[PDB]
UniProtKB/Swiss-Prot annotation, chain B:
Piezo comes from the Greek 'piesi' meaning pressure. It comes from the Eukaryota. Pore-forming subunit of a mechanosensitive non-specific cation channel. Generates currents characterized by a linear current-voltage relationship. Plays a role in reproduction by positively regulating inter-tissue signaling to promote oocyte maturation, ovulation and fertilization, and sperm navigation from and to the spermatheca. May play a role in regulating cytosolic and endoplasmic reticulum calcium ion release. This is Piezo-type mechanosensitive ion channel component 1. It comes from Caenorhabditis elegans. Disulfide bonds: none annotated. It is found in: Cell membrane. Expressed in the pharyngeal-intestinal and spermathecal-uterine valves and in multiple reproductive tissues including the germline, somatic oviduct, and spermatheca. During reproduction, it is expressed in sheath cells, sperm, both spermathecal valves and the spermathecal bag cells. Disruption phenotype: Reduced brood size due to defects in ovulation with incomplete constriction of the sheath cells impairing oocyte transit, an accumulation of ooplasm in the uterus as a result of 'crushed' oocytes, caused by incomplete opening of the spermathecal-uterine valve, which in wild-type allows the fertilized oocyte to be expelled into the uterus, and sperm navigation defects. The chain holds residues 2106 to 2153 of 2442 of the full protein. Belongs to the PIEZO (TC 1.A.75) family.
Length: 482, 48, 18
């Protein structure tokens, strides 16, 4: 009947929506779903076959060119030939044929519509993409477009920082220096230096892969004598090697380690490569104003639901969210969190009293005060966290000797050097009774609270000096006056 | 057939605490349970 | 210039008060 016809047309509409989803996921992703099956099942087996095709992908990123497309066709067949010779990998056998199917479906769409054949990241009106705003699909469209410049930097920054810091070993220090140099200065030439450092990282990732697959399953040939086999004898020296990732045979290497760094090296490289392309609007205004009178002007938009509440919470974020993540840091109950304690209260009192009334000839100095005060502290504490756990895991002026020296060193480890935290490691009997006597809470890792804090403070300090918050202080001063 | 001196009970209770290890939380939980079991009996309800 | 900013402020403030 008519109800049957309407049900059929609803099913056809659903089929059209699903077809649109298939097309958009075909065009927008392309190699992501392949690259991740590549790594997830890489972790699963870890036998040589992966080596040729893992160095392959990293160099493919290091050859950002149309030659990259020859390596794309390599990703197409490489697997088919090696899989046939060796006879869920059988699913990958037909999955590479799906790449040719993707091209086949592209040709089908070419003859259907009378539009030019080109890639389209923005499927629905381009004007709405410039809107950046409320009410609809433009939310996921925003996830797409501002991944290119503004939200993309913060997303990749939080991704790399949090992932590597929760890994909490080796990499932790090099990328700690990366963080120090990135967050300390603000510059595009330093971004080009960072373009040359990510190029180095793109080689260093296959270095880590090769370190994990350095030898066939087992033949007991060489292991650089465990990094110069120092002079000590301990699981501490065992873990010195756990740390310098040199060879190490009897280990199921953490799959999470490889998945994290691989995926977060892919995202960062893509983000930075796009970053080099176009311009920016973050800090060029500040140098113009520097060269109590901020003069960026823009409309205040319309209060029509969603946008109202989004911009309203954006206003409140200065008070509740950032300081509350610092308060989670307060609950970190550490000697380093004590510095946070009498930093946060002063921030509340002084900052409120100071930029309620737009302090004269002190707004720029106050925003520098906030920037340095709540970025340098969190970076210094996050940098030492990994360094001090390195110190604890290894041997240096051991803290178990003498009576007065023993007491002083026990107090020192009580509040400062604490204990190492890593899932797999070992200890000996003497250190066992030493830790029994000194005692510790064995829970320190920063993944609980420091990561969200740092995320908020960077994400908002790149906003606290830009965009409409510069126009927001007008509301602050008007409210104070009235 | 006789009761237990408080010295022996104190020695047993003291030995129950130090049985664990520094890292594993399961060892701590086991020690807590074993100590909680003993405290329900006074020295006047234990027979050697 | 300055007068325009002054009148803009003296127009915006009563609107906010209302």
């Amino acid at each position: 009947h008519a109800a049957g016809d309407t049900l059929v047309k609803k099913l056809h509409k659903l089929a059209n929506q699903t077809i649109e989803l298939l097309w958009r996921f075909f065009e927008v992703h392309i190699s992501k779903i392949v690259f991740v099956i590549i790594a997830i099942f890489i972790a699963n087996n870890i036998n040589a076959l992966y080596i040729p095709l893992v160095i392959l992908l990293s160099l493919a990123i290091c050859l950002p060119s149309a030659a990259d497309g020859i390596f794309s066709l390599f990703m197409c067949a490489y697997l088919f030939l090696v899989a046939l010779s060796k006879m869920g990998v059988i699913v990958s056998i037909i999955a590479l044929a799906f790449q040719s199917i993707v091209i086949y479906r592209q040709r089908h769409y070419r003859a259907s519509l009378g539009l030019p054949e080109s890639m389209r990241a923005k499927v629905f009106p381009d004007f709405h993409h410039s809107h950046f705003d409320r009410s609809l699909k433009n939310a996921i469209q925003f996830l797409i477009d501002y991944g290119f410049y503004k939200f993309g930097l913060e997303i990749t920054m939080i991704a790399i920082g949090i992932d590597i810091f929760n890994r909490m070993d080796a990499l932790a220090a090099i990328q700690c220096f990366w963080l120090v140099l990135f967050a300390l200065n603000k510059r595009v030439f330093v971004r080009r230096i960072w373009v040359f450092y990510v190029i180095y990282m793109a080689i260093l990732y296959p270095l880590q892969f090769f370190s994990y697959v350095g030898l066939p399953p087992d033949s007991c040939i060489e292991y650089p004598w465990s990094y110069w086999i120092p002079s000590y004898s301990d699981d501490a020296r065992f873990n010195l090697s756990y740390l310098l990732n040199l060879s190490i045979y009897g280990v199921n290497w953490p799959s999470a380690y490889l998945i994290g760094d691989f995926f977060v090296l892919l995202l960062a490289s893509c983000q930075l490569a796009v970053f080099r392309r176009e311009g920016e609007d973050n800090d060029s205004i500040y140098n113009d104003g520097n060269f109590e009178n901020p003069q960026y002007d823009f409309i205040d938009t319309k209060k029509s639901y969603v946008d109202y509440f989004k911009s309203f919470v954006f206003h409140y974020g200065h008070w509740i969210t950032l300081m509350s993540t610092l308060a989670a840091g307060i609950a970190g109950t550490s000697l380093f969190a004590l510095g946070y304690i009498i930093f946060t209260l002063t921030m509340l009192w002084s900052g409120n009293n100071l930029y309620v009334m737009n302090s004269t000839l002190r707004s720029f100095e106050h925003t520098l005060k906030r920037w340095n005060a709540l970025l340098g502290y969190t970076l210094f504490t996050i940098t030492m966290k990994v360094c001090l756990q390195i110190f604890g895991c290894v041997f240096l002026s051991w803290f178990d000797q003498s009576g007065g020296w023993g007491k002083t060193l026990c107090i020192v480890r009580q509040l400062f050097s604490i204990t190492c935290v890593n899932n797999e490691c070992h200890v000996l009997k003497e250190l066992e009774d030493f830790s029994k006597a000194c005692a510790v809470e064995t829970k320190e890792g920063n993944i609980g609270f420091d990561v969200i804090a740092l995320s908020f403070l960077v994400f908002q300090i790149r906003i606290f000096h830009s965009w409409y918050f510069q126009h927001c202080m007008v509301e602050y001063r008007s409210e104070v006056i009235l | 057939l006789g009761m237990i001196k408080p010295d022996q009970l104190a020695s047993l209770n003291q030995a129950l605490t130090d049985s664990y290890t520094t890292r594993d939380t399961n060892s701590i939980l086991r020690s807590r349970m074993s100590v909680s079991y003993l405290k329900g009996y006074t020295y006047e309800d234990i027979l050697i | 210039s300055r007068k325009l900013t002054d009148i803009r402020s003296a127009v915006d403030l009563p609107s906010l008060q209302l």
